[PDB]
Design a protein around this motif. Structure first.
Motif: not given
Ligand SMILES: Nc1ncnc2c1ncn2[C@@H]1O[C@H](COP(=O)(O)OP(=O)(O)O)[C@@H](O)[C@H]1O
Ligand SMILES: Nc1ncnc2c1ncn2[C@@H]1O[C@H](COP(=O)(O)OP(=O)(O)O)[C@@H](O)[C@H]1O
Ligand SMILES: Nc1ncnc2c1ncn2[C@@H]1O[C@H](COP(=O)(O)OP(=O)(O)O)[C@@H](O)[C@H]1O
Ligand SMILES: [Mg+2]
Ligand SMILES: [Mg+2]
Ligand SMILES: [Mg+2]
Ligand SMILES: [Mg+2]
Ligand SMILES: [Mg+2]
Lengths: 223, 434, 430, 433
Positions: D97, D101, D217-218, D221-222, D225-226, D228-229, D237-238, D241-242
């Motif tokens: 999944e 890299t 974690e940031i 999170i950023n 919303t999901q 965090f789940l 994953g993936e 990069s912005e």
């Protein structure tokens, strides 16, 4: 909720409006019927979700209460020296020029949670002497906020031991009186007078042009 | 205080107005042709007209290809978008490498916009239907300098019901977007209860309706993701629209045609300005033959800007091919449309100035005997071993309480730490696979 | 206002052929390749004829010949209202979509359908608006006056006319144009507007839609969301068969006319053998567009097999296809191509810089000179003159190196560059 | 306290055990021997404790039974709290999944953390009585209660949410609360007379709270919303990069404003020999980034063929990785150091050994391996325990030697019984005659 409220900053700066309605098929015209969007919008209207904090935190970037001291260069080291004078058991005075920094300084002093009393031209005559005798007697008030023209000219404050200057326009006699309100006959402790000068600004050029010319009088600041 | 990790000593190329490159300027010693030619590439990006140009940087290790890539990335400035990328990163299993490659070609370009938005704020007075209804709500926002009533949509009213506001709460409402933020209970109701979890904020100064203009920049690929999939919203239909299919897919060409169609309409109105950018691909020899053959047609495309490559090989076998032997790991059709900038090596004195200027940026004091010894290690083991051993000599100087690097500190660095050839010479003698 | 910066394929606008199909030496951006442009004109009148289908053609040749530029000239001389699909050879390889069904998706994308109908329109200036509703009940009753140069009448409105009249703000001074069948209002101008003509006019509207769009739309409802988001793939063939009989019935009834489009595939050499046999079947279908292929590689091993098949394609594909080949150019045609690239890039060149640029274009390649003409105006521009000198071309030659020169530099510096076995001399001595 | 600690192979090693002059002691803090490796690891320890430099990779190599993973365990144990340490495997980055890299970028974001502090107010004091006021039909509750301490006793009127949290959570007059004003939640800590509560100090006090959060974690999170789940369930994953670029500029702006201070953590990768060449070139780029933690690698294999290529590269790694990295090597141990290691494993396992059992166990530890003797010390106390004495005898070590066989002895038994075991071509003699 605290980690979400503190660590969610970035926003999806590019969006297309009215795409949320079309992605599910519920709009003013579609292949679905008329009360599919109504009953779906009502069952959606009743059902709540616990992710609304992350939704509102991710849609708009919240300019929270912390940026009062982080957007100002003078307020970076001000709370550090206020903590240093708090741990050493000293009192301080703050003299400004305009009244627009007084309410911002009141919100900063209410943010860091000290005990203060403000004296300026917006106060009355009855609260002035009581606010003077409250600071002159032994109390828990650490910082006493004044102004240049109103309350920094002829009062007899002997309680504080520190003078803090945010900005000084005229200083051969006028700014000397403000620091001379602190140093009086009834002070047995040494007066430590600080001064806030920025870097590569006009105020950085005022004292640099006044140090070479022995600080007589300033006319034109140009660099 | 200041973190230095094989960079931050270069503040650009440091060229003159005539074009002639200096010997010692901007963290660079030697390498006149790649710096001056790199400045020609800098002006080529500053032309805002060229596209499809591909210039690879080929050379050995410790020669300054990635440092020249940070030199062009620093010489362009923050207004020009720079996209760092590695050829090993283009492999994906969600979509193909074609979509990531052409998508990165849409990531290099930038486009700055200007737009005005309306700002509404004030204390909530009444939440009531109009007089008769289908359930809309007039929200009477009491500001300091004015009092106005406004009618809202049921969706922004639903977010108003989400924020749990009441009579006498300061809110923040945006007109064009519809987002709702609550500031808190107003200061007039602070004396109603002695303790309350809701903080008390003052009344917002100014008018009710406010306007401002932003010069916000946003990349064209960000508009492509904004045209591709739903991101978020505060309603159930938008959040479930996100939650249903959030997996990113390939993008058709007609979608990009409508995106740059309305973008071209925005540049016909005089609002936006199109500026090209830079896609820099690291380790091009690690790419597959499919990404090379899509780079052949992709460089023949229009929107592909000045792309800088970096390959550190020669006559080797291309990945995905069996018998094809080609220079730099690049096929000869792609190498025909490529431009090669040869990198020059450095002498003993230039290694001494690399260790010298890296020592001044690293804020360490080196004596002349240890500088000549690190010059001999620079001409004996490698450049990266001497630059790697700049820090443990200062660490042993800190443990020995010395402020300067001495002979015994760098010889102790020779005893505690070994280079490549000593490691191979030690591993040549084996009892049971040493 | 098709978006047009300076491309390699921007100067080529049209094939540039005469009525007798003999190509001119300099016409419409294409210079040289008389047989390739004449045969491409035979393909152009083959698409413009439209009486035949199910034919594949191939354009081959060495690099720097412009077979992709020839197909660009065919697509530019094709004009509007005819669909042109230009896909890559490695574009069909996908993980969510099979290669065969993506190739079928391109074969359905190439051919379009024109369907026309007539609608009524009432355009005229508004005099005043007088709606009537109730404070408790509802049931709005709208009345307004529509005026033009030779007609001025009052129109009573229904419920949906006040729904669209109140959801979209309008004034007495504002002027509307109402369609009866659509029911939506066009608030065009206020008192731009300066109108003429009759009040109610009927005009015909024509829509062009390809067969692939009807395929994913008639697949399911969320095939429209898959038409925009691109999450389609692997459609059932009952939609294709019943859609083929429905399109044939629309042709028999005369309702819908179709346009035979052109399918262009770039870099067709590295294609799978399953797609090769799938083209070998799909070229014989009824709704099969004209396919133009550009085999770019040489003789090598085909992907999916072990043997080295000639041309990079099996003979079953090349048996049912026609092949056009291109040849190399002369020394004068490189100077003419650099002159028309100077006219396209708006670059003023000198005679000696064009001669030296022609010589280094003959010696190295076409593309290197076609970029040295771009950078030479900027080495000239740093000297603040628009005229390009020979010093700028010599500086641009010594700065930007050719591939063969740095091949000599790589072979001279093989100790510097990393070898096949990973060995590299990163030191200088020992 | 009370990190979960049974008897591990890496449990006795607590700290690097170095002096102020960085010269290692012979016996200190569970680590005996390897003076140069522990001194260089102390240079890495003060390199992390300095924090002024970044973007550096180090490698710890050597033969088996040398403790390079134990050396990195000593570095992570001497690192202390509040600094993030990420210990991942070399084959852990291979996922279906998640790309290898982006998982390596996820580890590089997991290694570095951020400390953010703020101040909150707290009112802690004993409750005297509670007197709420509501209505039988209307609502609109009006709460009043009295808060008392040693030198303050006052009545606090309550709002709507104070009675919401005061009635959601059961409380009494005898029960004692501690209320935060900003959080709005109640801490019912103790109770009076029949609890714990016995409070001192002032009523309302302000204390500072510090939270530690890594950059990964940031990042998730950023992302959405999901995320965090996906941070708990692991279905991330993936990331685009912005988020990484704007989060890098936001973190740099937080460093410039002085709001958030970051802690440079250590990234440890175990069994880095079987790694893909794409991850090798990705490390070759990612070591030069600004926010790049100190990377410690443990190449465990020998010279062989790298996975993804055909040629046999030396060290199992390409030279582009080994050029920008420092290498520490370890050597074999003496006969006395095996007896010392078995003695400190006897102290860790709480096993009382005899002198002759330690000598014979030292001899069979020199002859066969370290690990076989390090398990024979465990089973020898239990062959001794079946004789109901805590003392370990030589008979238990000899029985544990004849029962548990070495690898080379059963290699001789396999080569003697090749007709019994199945061959490479699947042939096997399952009969006797
Ligand atoms: N001309 C130069 N002047 C100063 N430093 C250099 C120069 N060339 C290379 N370096 C240094 O060498 C280090 C490694 O070089 P790098 O760019 O990684 O080589 P490559 O691109 O071949 O991998 C860089 O950190 C850079 O600071
Ligand atoms: N007949 C022609 N007229 C104008 N330009 C041409 C012609 N033939 C080739 N070119 C030039 O060749 C370049 C592209 O060649 P290309 O079509 O990519 O070759 P290939 O298809 O063999 O790779 C273009 O920049 C174009 O200017
Ligand atoms: N310096 C040391 N002090 C104490 N025990 C050690 C030391 N070095 C190695 N060991 C022992 O070695 C074992 C760990 O070996 P390990 O590092 O896993 O082998 P490898 O290097 O082959 O992975 C542990 O049981 C530990 O007790
Ligand atoms: Mg007086
Ligand atoms: Mg590099
Ligand atoms: Mg081609
Ligand atoms: Mg057939
Ligand atoms: Mg190990």
């Amino acid at each position: 909720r605290k980690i979400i409220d503190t660590f969610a900053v970035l926003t999806p700066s590019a969006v297309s409006l009215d795409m949320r309605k079309l992605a599910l098929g519920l709009n003013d015209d579609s292949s679905v019927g008329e009360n599919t969007r109504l009953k779906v919008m009502q069952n959606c209207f009743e059902v709540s979700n616990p992710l609304h904090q992350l939704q509102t935190k991710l849609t708009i970037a919240f300019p929270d209460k912390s940026l009062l001291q982080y957007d100002c260069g003078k307020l970076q080291k001000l709370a550090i020296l206020l903590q240093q004078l708090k741990d050493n058991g000293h009192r301080a005075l703050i003299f400004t020029q305009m009244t627009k920094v007084l309410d911002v300084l009141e919100q900063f002093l209410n943010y860091h949670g000290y005990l203060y009393m403000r004296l300026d031209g917006a106060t009355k005559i009855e609260d002035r002497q009581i606010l003077t005798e409250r600071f002159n007697t032994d109390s828990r008030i650490t910082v006493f906020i004044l102004s240049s023209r109103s309350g920094g000219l002829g009062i007899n404050l002997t309680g504080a031991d520190t003078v803090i200057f945010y900005d000084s326009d005229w200083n051969p006699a006028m700014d000397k009186q403000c620091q001379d309100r602190c140093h009086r006959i009834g002070q047995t402790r040494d007066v430590h007078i600080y001064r806030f000068v920025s870097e590569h600004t006009i105020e950085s050029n005022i004292l640099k042009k006044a140090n070479q010319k022995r600080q007589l009088d300033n006319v034109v600041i140009q660099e | 205080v200041t973190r230095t990790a094989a960079h931050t000593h270069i503040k650009g190329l440091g060229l003159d107005e005539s074009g002639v490159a200096k010997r010692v300027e901007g963290g660079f010693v030697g390498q006149i042709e790649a710096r001056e030619a790199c400045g020609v590439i800098v002006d080529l990006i500053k032309a805002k007209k060229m596209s499809g140009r591909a210039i690879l940087l080929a050379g050995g290790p410790s020669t300054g290809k990635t440092a020249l890539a940070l030199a062009i990335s620093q010489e362009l400035g923050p207004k020009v978008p720079f996209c760092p990328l590695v050829g090993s990163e283009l492999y994906s299993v969600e979509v193909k490498k074609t979509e990531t490659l052409m998508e990165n070609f849409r990531r290099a370009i930038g486009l700055r916009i200007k737009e005005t938005k309306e700002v509404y704020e004030g204390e909530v007075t009444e939440l009531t239907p109009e007089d008769k209804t289908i359930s809309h709500v007039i929200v009477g926002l009491k500001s300091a300098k004015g009092t106005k009533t406004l009618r809202l949509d049921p969706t922004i009213y639903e977010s108003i019901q989400r924020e749990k506001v009441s009579i006498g709460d300061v809110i923040y409402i945006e007109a064009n977007t519809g987002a709702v933020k609550r500031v808190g209970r107003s200061d007039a109701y602070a004396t109603e209860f002695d303790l309350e979890t809701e903080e008390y904020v003052p009344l917002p100064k100014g008018e009710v309706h406010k306007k401002k203009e932003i010069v916000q920049d946003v990349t064209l690929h960000d508009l492509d993701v904004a045209n591709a999939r739903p991101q978020g919203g505060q309603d159930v239909i938008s959040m479930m629209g996100q939650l249903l299919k959030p997996k990113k897919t390939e993008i058709t060409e007609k979608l990009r045609q409508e995106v740059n169609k309305v973008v071209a309409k925005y540049i016909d109105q005089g609002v936006a300005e199109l500026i090209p950018g830079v896609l820099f691909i690291d380790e091009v020899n690690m790419l597959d033959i499919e990404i090379f053959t899509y780079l052949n047609k992709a460089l023949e495309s229009n929107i592909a800007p000045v792309v800088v490559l970096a390959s550190n090989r020669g006559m080797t076998t291309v990945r995905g091919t069996e018998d094809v032997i080609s220079p730099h790991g690049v096929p000869p059709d792609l190498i025909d449309r490529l431009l090669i900038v040869r990198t020059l090596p450095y002498d003993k004195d230039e290694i001494r100035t690399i260790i010298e200027r890296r020592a001044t940026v690293e804020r360490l004091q080196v004596e002349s005997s240890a500088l000549d010894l690190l010059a001999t290690m620079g001409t004996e083991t490698s450049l990266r071993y001497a630059l790697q051993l700049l820090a443990p000599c200062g660490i042993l100087a800190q443990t020995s309480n010395r402020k300067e690097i001495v002979v015994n500190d760098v010889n102790e660095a020779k005893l505690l730490f070994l280079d490549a050839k000593r490691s191979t010479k030690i591993l040549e003698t084996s009892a049971n696979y040493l | 206002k098709s978006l047009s910066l300076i491309a390699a394929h921007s100067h080529i606008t049209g094939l540039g052929l005469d009525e007798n199909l003999q190509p001119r030496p300099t016409s419409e951006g294409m210079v040289g390749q008389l047989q390739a442009r004449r045969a491409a004109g035979v393909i152009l009148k083959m698409v413009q004829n439209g009486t035949i289908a199910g034919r594949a053609v191939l354009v081959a040749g060495p690099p720097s010949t412009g077979k992709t530029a020839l197909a660009m000239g065919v697509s530019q001389s094709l004009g509007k209202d005819v669909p042109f699909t230009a896909i890559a050879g490695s574009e069909i390889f996908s993980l969510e979509l099979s290669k065969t069904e993506a190739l079928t998706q391109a074969f359905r994308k190439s051919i379009g359908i024109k369907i026309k109908e007539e609608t009524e329109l009432i355009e005229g200036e508004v005099v005043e608006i007088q709606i009537d509703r109730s404070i408790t009940g509802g049931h709005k009753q709208g009345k307004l006056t529509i005026k033009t140069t030779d007609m001025e009448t009052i129109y009573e409105l229904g419920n949906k006319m006040i729904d669209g009249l109140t959801k979209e703000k309008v004034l007495a001074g504002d002027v509307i144009s109402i369609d009866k069948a659509s029911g939506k209002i066009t608030k065009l101008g206020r008192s731009v507007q300066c109108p003429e003509g009759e009040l109610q006019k009927r005009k015909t509207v024509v829509h062009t839609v390809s067969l692939h769009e009807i395929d994913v739309i008639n697949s399911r409802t969320q095939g429209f969301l898959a038409l925009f988001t691109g999450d389609t793939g692997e459609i059932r063939s009952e939609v294709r068969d019943q859609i083929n009989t429905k399109v044939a019935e629309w042709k028999e009834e005369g309702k819908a006319e179709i346009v035979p489009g052109v399918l262009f595939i770039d870099e067709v050499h590295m294609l799978d053998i399953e797609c090769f046999s799938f083209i070998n079947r799909a070229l014989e279908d009824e709704f099969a567009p004209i396919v133009m292929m550009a085999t770019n590689r040489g003789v090598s091993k085909t992907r999916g097999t072990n043997y080295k098949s000639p041309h990079g394609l099996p003979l079953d594909l090349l048996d049912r296809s026609i092949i056009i080949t291109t040849k190399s150019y002369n020394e004068q045609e490189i100077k003419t191509i650099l002159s028309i690239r100077a006219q396209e890039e708006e670059v003023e060149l000198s005679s000696d810089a064009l001669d030296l640029l022609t010589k280094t274009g003959v010696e190295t390649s076409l593309r290197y000179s076609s970029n040295l003409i771009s950078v030479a105006q900027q080495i000239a521009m740093k000297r603040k003159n628009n005229t390009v000198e020979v010093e700028d071309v010599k500086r641009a030659y010594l700065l930007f190196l050719d591939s063969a020169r740095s091949v000599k530099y790589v072979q001279e510096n093989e100790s510097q560059y990393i070898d096949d076995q990973g060995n590299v001399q990163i030191s200088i001595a020992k």
